[PDB]
Design a binder for this molecule. Structure first.
Ligand code: MG
Ligand code: ZN
Ligand code: ZN
Lengths: 50, 50, 148, 397, 33, 103, 53, 65, 147, 50, 343, 49, 148
């Protein structure tokens, strides 16, 4: 947990979630379902354009 | 800046794109696919020399 | 008249490797007029066959005897004079392989046509003179009728 | 202006598991929202993540930069990482409950009428496939009854619409290939597809699974791009469960019970093996025993006893496989290769093999014997680790 | 002629559990202490 | 807002029509599928569910000729109406006859 | 020696490489991540040297 | 800790008979004839009334009162 | 140490009459210990002795008889119905999960105030119950349902 | 030496196995320690093979 | 012949030793060449019929002939989920001293069926938790458990010790609103079974609450399901390929149900036959006897469905089937109106 | 209740995860009739508890 | 008061740990001839690899018990055998192997293969998705190193 291994090589970040998984065949292989509760928390900054 | 290999694996092929057993292509399957996808009934056959 | 082949076969074996399936059996048949061997897969539940039974078989390019080759699609509800009306068991398939006999290393004259009836195999082997008109990747019909 | 919008559909989002072995353990996908509370995705990506849906937690990271999002979509795209860089073998492919379903679908005994075939075909017309023509293939048998085989329904997955330029072609051998068929196998194990149309053979893990090359999805990826293979896999994963549910696939206690002839063969083999082991014991203890070159006499005896017990096991397994009738769910799963194998079936039904610890029989924990329930210096099969009975009949302590 | 077997042999187990068994170990140890 | 129609492609062809039905489940979908399946001029009929979370279904209909694929839908609806009226009348008559013969 | 080498159980099976009776199987159970067992087949009569999983 | 009103699988009202079941346990009737008299043809209601434990009495023994 | 029934001359020291007297209350386990019918054996002591699992397995060279085979399993493994028909990692995972299974704790769980407690709304006793379940009275405090 | 009624009067479950101490309101259990037997000669191979 | 096999596949469903065949419905135009499977309302109305074989309180058994599996499954699913009834959703509690949890108590009260007629009420609109006289009912429960003033000295049984210690569903009282008292006569609005055990009490405890019963469908929650078990099965038609005589005939009676196979003496020798294939359950035990496997043939009729419907006491099951048919008619009418509005 | 009843009869090892020897972590015949073979915690404590 | 939902871990008294993947209505659930609809659907594919025949034996014993109102014992190296529960099943009128005639709830047509129904002891674990779901906004950071 030092500076090199615990704070430089690998460090914790925000805008992340951890949840239990469950199978769903009705979704594409490149798609993934996200719960509404986590979706209301994780935000993406978009810039206003034309 | 020191060079480890003048060419990767002596040939420079991507291991992920390897379609055969350590070989880039399998000529038999490719030839069969070409024959099946493009069957020309209005053109004659070819001999060895041709 | 797109009749590519026509003969009368007799069954020499029903299941040489046992009853591998319930609704399908590996029929092995031999022609009486020519030297044409036939390995066939059919549905015995709707069309049962026996060892001592003979059947007239016809491989046709089209199902209409008038000569119209308009076979872009097939509607089962159609009612019109066709070849299937003169037969009992009709299967629509596609000839997909032509392979020469490998037993005769020289002066070989026997060829075999491999046709897929939706997974139901049909290998018709015999002299190449009888198989005239057969071309790979060609959609055709098979019509069989049992005889006395 | 910078607006912190909620996670909506279409956003590229990461998806990672805590134990990361290879690069495919963390991949970028397209985010979708659902009212439930779990991360749901297609099971075809379970092989890279090595997940099993037994309560394992999963991470999900959301980039905060357009450049990072684009790099995730391009490099870590699911459709662009269908193969591992280790040996080129595809990992995202069919899995359990999909291999068995497609195998039962592509069986030669399956025949569907117009209504059921139309329902099975329409079971995939969702999402981007809602704006394509069905292209119902012509029926095979039409005179007595109009029937569609399961192989045509499976080929529909490859080429759903008329305008689809996908022309898949493959020619390979299955797992149960006899060796002399060459598209004439009695077991129908020679896979042959021409122009995205299954001609013969039975689909299994050797062709649909992520085992090795010659996979149909691998050929689609290498010959027609990533999108076509992804669409084919989605159609398969949306078609196979519907048919598997509408048909029925169950295992019961009667599917693992032994037969009369199987019990007779097991008894005879056990008697013969016990007699041979007693002969070997008497030869080594009293007199001269043939010493195997490269080892001592006791190691030779141990090897001979192991060989005899394993011969008994293999013969009992062969007898059980011969006496087992078709439509058996464990046998079907072993044939299709979705889960289990012939060894597991033989161990559950016929006989359990020798319990091998570190590639050898059970060592003597006590003085000159494994357990006090056996005589000292006794090297009998059951006394050193052999299991005479099976899991169905019950195991001794 | 098989040797006769006591059918209620397992009845020896509950009688043993009445004075010893699951939790009596730590109890007897702490009492002796 | 409940039932809507989708064309097969940008060509807006009336031969292949996908009806998206909201607030529906397998019951009425399968009933209508069976009722319109017996129509001779229907090449393909098939219903499916988009996702078990949402209560909506998609039923695709492709006819033989130049049928708008909407007329067979209304025909099947009217036929199911007639079948339901007939079974209701028959069940009421049977219940009445049973209750009368019981006494 | 081939006589001492053939101290194995599997005889007259169907290998997935050449489909010939002769065989030399090895069964391993030392995998907890992979619940099923592990096979190693050695088909060798004409000195083919088949070795796979 | 208490007998549920409806069975999990079917949904037939089964709690109202629980006391009666106890009454059938106070008479000569065994389990089988009691479940037969209660009108439980399907085995789900039989399982619901048999595998249930009446822990409400033990809890009320610890109730404040 | 483990108790074992003394066997002499190919016959156990405990007979059906002794078990009937035990069931009626004439004797207890201590009386079996005193009358040289059941004795404790250590690992080192049983290393030199011969034990038989069942009566049909008893041979001429037998010193003690196993009381009960299912006593080999502990407390959690006793909850497994027919454990000899399953794989051993399956039994290990089952014990690990049963150590974390939710259910009733005791009769005073309502008055008990712990930092974290999990209770089942409609707990039901198992249909396929082991004798160990009845010995530990698990059926009075189930930790699951029957579905 | 208490009856289940006396256990109910003391707010304690009779089926409770017990065997644990209560300190500061928390329940602590002392695990059974396992150790090598003392006063016994042990013959073993050394790290160098002796 | 081939026609016999075609008829067996089209009209019968055979149950083999390992699996069931001919399960798919195939009587559609285009599948059979030698038959005109096009829809005909006249032939359908001619071949269809409904015959009730048993009908008592909370139980109905009737055979339908001529209907298909799709319409039968639709009726079953409408009866199971799409029949609206009256059940409790909102619970207002006032100082619950019971040991039973308040949430568990409300969940148990929600599962209690109500004898109120669901057709006389309407669905509650979104919001308006207060509820209106048209689409709500109020059931007030107030039970106080106290010690019996006069009882025996021992009083080992809790019945003699205390009073009202078991809160049965009979203690609740329906409180009319507006004009519900005049519209509904006394005794109509009441608990169904009147003997459901809600909870058990002790002296000092008290349960006081009000239940707001509203309308809802079974699809939203299982508590609105009016039927306990509403299902249908295909009518078995056991046929004998060869005449069965001798002691093996008795074996036949032991293989199938006791009430389907009957034995008689034509000329002093025993002979078995089919008496009533309705009572058979298809245990498939005849497959155990090796000799008798080739003499019988288990079959199910494709167009003969025996429906068994057990109501929970809210209303008789015939009215339940009528309301299911009416709900299907209403769905069809809604779809027709939507299609007309589109055009 | 099962959790507490099982924890009341737990035994720890002297090694306490000092080195992955895998020797004492294995199942020995000496545990016959004295210790439960199947019951063991899943993880790094397998074979030591 | 927590209700089972997607993500709740479940045990099966045989080490077959499971997670709720989908919640289907009662109408979509298959039914028996008497009208019984089973609650939980278990994957059969987990049986061959994990050789959990004891689960099938427990299911059969529990079915026999709920049929005859008995508690069959699953004692190690003993207990009730398969013959007794098979005789109980053949006496009560059910199949002697558990597999029964099952009709599909969705399509309304019978299934091709028989389905294995039975009462099994299911136990829910403490591992619930409600306590494991965790999302992270910007939030606080550590004092020493400005990291989450
Ligand atoms: Mg896992
Ligand atoms: Zn080989
Ligand atoms: Zn029930």
């Amino acid at each position: 947990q030092g500076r090199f291994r615990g704070n430089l090589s690998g460090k914790r970040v925000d805008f992340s979630g951890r949840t239990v998984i469950s199978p769903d065949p009705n979704l594409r292989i490149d798609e993934v379902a996200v719960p509404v509760h986590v979706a209301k928390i994780l935000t993406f900054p978009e810039k206003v354009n034309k | 800046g020191d060079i480890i290999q003048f060419i990767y694996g002596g040939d420079g092929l991507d291991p992920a794109a390897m379609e055969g057993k350590d070989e880039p292509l399998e000529f038999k399957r490719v030839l069969d696919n070409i024959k099946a996808v493009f069957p020309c009934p209005s053109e004659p056959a070819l001999s060895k020399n041709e | 008249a797109g009749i590519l082949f026509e003969d009368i076969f007799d069954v020499k074996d029903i299941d040489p490797e046992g009853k591998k399936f319930d609704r399908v059996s590996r029929l092995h048949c031999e022609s009486e007029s020519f030297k044409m061997d036939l390995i066939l897969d059919v549905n015995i539940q709707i069309y049962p066959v026996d060892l001592g039974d003979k059947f007239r078989l016809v491989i046709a390019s089209t199902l209409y005897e008038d000569g119209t080759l308009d076979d872009g699609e097939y509607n089962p509800t159609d009612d019109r004079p066709s070849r299937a009306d003169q037969f009992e068991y009709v299967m629509y398939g596609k000839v997909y392989r032509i392979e020469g006999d490998e037993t005769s290393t020289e002066a070989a004259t026997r060829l075999s046509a491999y046709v897929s009836y939706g997974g139901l195999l049909m290998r018709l082997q015999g002299d190449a003179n009888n198989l005239h008109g057969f071309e790979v990747d060609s959609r055709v019909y098979l019509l069989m009728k049992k005889l006395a | 202006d910078i607006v912190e919008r909620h996670l909506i559909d279409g956003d590229v989002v990461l998806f990672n598991r805590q134990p990361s072995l290879h690069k495919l353990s963390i991949m970028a996908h397209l985010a979708r929202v659902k009212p439930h509370r779990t991360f749901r995705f297609n099971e075809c990506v379970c092989t890279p993540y090595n997940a099993d849906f037994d309560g394992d937690e999963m991470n999900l990271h959301l980039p905060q930069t357009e450049e990072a999002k684009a790099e995730a979509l391009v490099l870590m795209g699911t459709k662009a990482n269908l193969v591992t860089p280790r040996n080129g073998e595809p990992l995202i492919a069919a899995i359990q409950d999909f291999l068995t379903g497609a195998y039962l679908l592509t069986l030669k005994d399956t025949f569907f009428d117009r209504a059921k075939a139309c329902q099975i075909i329409a079971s995939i017309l969702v999402g981007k496939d809602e704006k394509i023509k069905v292209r119902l293939p012509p029926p095979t048998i039409l005179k007595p009854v109009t029937l569609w085989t399961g192989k045509q329904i499976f080929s529909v997955i490859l080429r759903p619409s008329d305008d689809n330029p996908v022309r898949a072609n493959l020619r390979t051998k299955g797992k149960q290939y006899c060796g002399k068929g060459e598209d004439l196998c009695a077991n129908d194990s020679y896979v042959t597809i021409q122009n995205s149309e299954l001609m013969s053979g039975s689909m299994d893990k050797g062709t649909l699974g992520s085992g090795s090359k010659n996979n149909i999805f691998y050929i689609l990826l290498r010959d027609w791009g990533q999108n076509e293979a992804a669409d084919a896999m989605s159609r398969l994963a949306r078609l196979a469960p519907v048919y598997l549910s509408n048909r029925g696939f169950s295992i019961g206690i009667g599917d693992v019970t032994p037969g009369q002839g199987l019990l007779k063969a097991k008894y005879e083999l056990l008697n013969a093996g016990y007699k041979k082991c007693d002969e070997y014991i008497e030869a080594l203890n009293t007199g001269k025993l043939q010493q195997q070159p490269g080892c001592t006499a006791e190691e030779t005896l141990e090897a001979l006893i192991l060989k005899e017990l394993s011969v008994i096991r293999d013969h009992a397994g062969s007898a059980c496989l011969r006496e087992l009738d078709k439509s058996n769910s464990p046998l079907t799963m072993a044939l299709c290769g979705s889960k289990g194998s012939f060894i597991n079936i033989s161990q559950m039904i016929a006989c359990v093999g020798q319990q091998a610890i570190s590639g050898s029989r059970v060592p003597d924990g006590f003085e000159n014997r494994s357990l006090p329930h056996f005589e000292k210096h006794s090297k009998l099969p059951a006394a050193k680790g052999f299991v005479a009975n099976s899991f169905y009949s019950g195991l001794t302590p | 002629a098989p040797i006769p077997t006591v059918e209620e042999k397992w009845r020896l187990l509950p009688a043993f559990l009445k004075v010893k068994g699951l939790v009596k170990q730590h109890i007897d140890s702490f009492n002796y202490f | 807002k409940t039932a809507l129609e989708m064309v097969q492609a940008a060509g807006t062809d009336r031969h292949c029509v996908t009806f998206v039905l909201h607030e529906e489940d397998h019951t009425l979908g399968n009933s209508l599928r069976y009722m319109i399946m017996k129509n001779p001029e229907v090449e393909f009929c098939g219903y499916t569910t988009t996702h078990p979370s949402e209560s909506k279904i998609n039923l695709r209909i492709q006819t033989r000729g130049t049928l708008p694929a909407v007329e067979p839908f209304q025909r099947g609806l009217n036929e199911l109406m007639n079948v339901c009226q007939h079974v209701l009348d028959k069940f009421e008559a049977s219940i009445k006859d049973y209750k009368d013969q019981k006494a | 020696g081939a006589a001492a080498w053939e101290n194995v159980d599997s005889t007259a099976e169907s290998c997935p490489k050449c489909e010939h009776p002769r065989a030399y199987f090895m069964q391993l159970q030392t995998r907890s991540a992979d619940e099923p067992m592990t096979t190693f087949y050695k088909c060798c009569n004409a000195q083919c040297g088949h070795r796979w999983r | 800790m208490i007998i549920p009103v409806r069975c999990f699988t079917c949904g037939k009202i089964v709690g109202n008979k629980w006391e009666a079941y106890l009454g059938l346990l106070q008479a000569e009737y065994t389990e089988g004839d009691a479940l037969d008299a209660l009108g439980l043809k399907r085995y789900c209601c039989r399982r619901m009334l048999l595998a249930h434990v009446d822990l409400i009495e033990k809890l009320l023994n610890y109730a404040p009162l | 140490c483990r108790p074992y029934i003394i066997v002499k001359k190919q016959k156990p020291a405990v007979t059906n009459k002794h078990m009937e007297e035990l069931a009626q209350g004439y004797r207890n386990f201590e009386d079996f210990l005193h009358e040289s019918l059941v004795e404790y054996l250590d690992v080192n002591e049983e290393n030199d002795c011969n034990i038989a699992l069942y009566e049909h397995t008893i041979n001429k060279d037998t010193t003690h008889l196993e009381i009960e085979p299912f006593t080999l399993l502990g407390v959690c493994a006793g909850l497994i119905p027919y454990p000899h028909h399953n794989q051993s990692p399956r039994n290990t995972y089952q014990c690990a999960m049963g150590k974390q299974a939710m259910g009733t704790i005791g009769y005073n769980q309502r008055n008990r105030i712990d930092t974290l407690m999990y209770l089942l709304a409609y707990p039901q006793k198992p249909m396929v119950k082991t004798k160990t379940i009845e010995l530990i009275e698990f059926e009075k405090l189930p930790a699951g349902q029957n579905a | 030496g208490k009856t289940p009624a006396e256990f109910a009067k003391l707010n304690e479950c009779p089926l409770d196995p017990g065997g644990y101490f209560i300190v500061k309101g928390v329940e602590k259990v002392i695990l059974i320690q396992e150790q090598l037997s003392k006063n016994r000669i042990i013959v073993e191979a050394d790290r160098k093979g002796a | 012949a081939a026609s016999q096999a075609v008829e067996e596949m089209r009209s019968r469903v055979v149950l083999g030793e390992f699996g069931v065949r001919n399960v798919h419905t195939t009587d559609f135009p285009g599948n059979y060449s030698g038959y005109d499977d096009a829809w005909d309302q006249d032939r359908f109305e001619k071949n269809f019929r409904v015959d009730v074989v048993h009908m008592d309180e909370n139980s109905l058994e009737f055979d339908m002939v001529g209907i298909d599996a799709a319409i039968a499954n639709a009726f079953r699913r409408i009866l199971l989920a799409e029949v609206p009834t009256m059940a409790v959703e909102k619970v207002l509690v006032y100082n619950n001293t019971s040991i039973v949890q308040d949430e568990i108590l409300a969940h148990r009260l929600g599962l209690i069926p109500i004898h109120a007629d669901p057709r006389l009420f309407e669905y509650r609109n979104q919001g308006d938790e207060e509820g209106t006289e048209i689409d709500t009912l109020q059931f007030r429960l107030q039970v106080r458990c106290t010690r019996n003033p006069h009882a025996a000295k021992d009083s080992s049984d809790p019945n003699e010790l205390y009073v009202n210690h078991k809160v049965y569903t009979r203690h609740m009282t329906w409180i009319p609103l507006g004009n519900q008292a005049d519209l509904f006569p006394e005794g109509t609005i009441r608990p169904v079974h009147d003997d459901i055990l809600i909870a058990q009490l002790r002296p000092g405890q008290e349960i006081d609450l009000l239940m707001h019963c509203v309308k809802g469908i079974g699809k939203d929650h299982a508590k609105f399901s009016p039927v306990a078990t509403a299902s249908y099965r295909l009518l078995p038609d056991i046929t004998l390929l060869e005449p069965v005589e001798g002691e093996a005939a008795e074996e036949l009676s032991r293989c199938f149900s006791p009430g389907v196979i009957e034995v008689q003496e034509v000329q002093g020798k025993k002979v078995a036959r089919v008496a009533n294939p309705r009572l058979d359950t298809f245990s498939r035990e005849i497959f155990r006897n090796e000799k008798l496997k080739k003499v019988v043939r288990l079959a199910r009729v494709r167009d003969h469905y025996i429906f068994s419907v057990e109501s929970t006491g809210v209303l008789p099951p015939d009215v339940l089937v009528s309301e299911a048919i009416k709900v299907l008619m209403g769905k069809c009418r809604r779809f027709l109106d939507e299609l007309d509005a589109v055009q | 209740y099962i959790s507490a009843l099982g924890m009341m009869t737990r035994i720890s090892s002297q090694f306490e995860k000092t080195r992955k020897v895998s020797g004492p972590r294995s199942l020995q015949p000496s545990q016959w009739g004295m210790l439960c073979p199947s019951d063991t915690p899943e993880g790094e404590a397998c074979g030591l508890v | 008061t927590r209700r089972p939902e997607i993500g709740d871990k479940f045990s099966s008294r045989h080490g077959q740990k499971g997670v709720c993947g989908l919640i289907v209505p009662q109408e979509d659930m298959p039914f028996c001839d008497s009208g019984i609809c089973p609650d939980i659907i278990m994957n059969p594919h987990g049986f061959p690899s994990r050789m959990t025949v004891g689960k099938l034996i427990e299911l059969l014993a529990g079915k026999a018990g709920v049929l005859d109102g008995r508690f069959h014992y699953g004692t190690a190296f003993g207990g009730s055998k398969v013959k007794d529960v098979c005789e109980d099943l053949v006496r009560h009128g059910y199949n002697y192997l558990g597999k029964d005639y099952v009709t599909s709830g969705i399509t309304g047509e019978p299934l091709e293969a028989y389905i294995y129904f039975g009462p099994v002891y299911y136990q829910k674990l403490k591992h619930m998705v409600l306590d494991k779901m965790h999302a992270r906004a910007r939030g606080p950071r550590a004092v020493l190193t400005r990291q989450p």
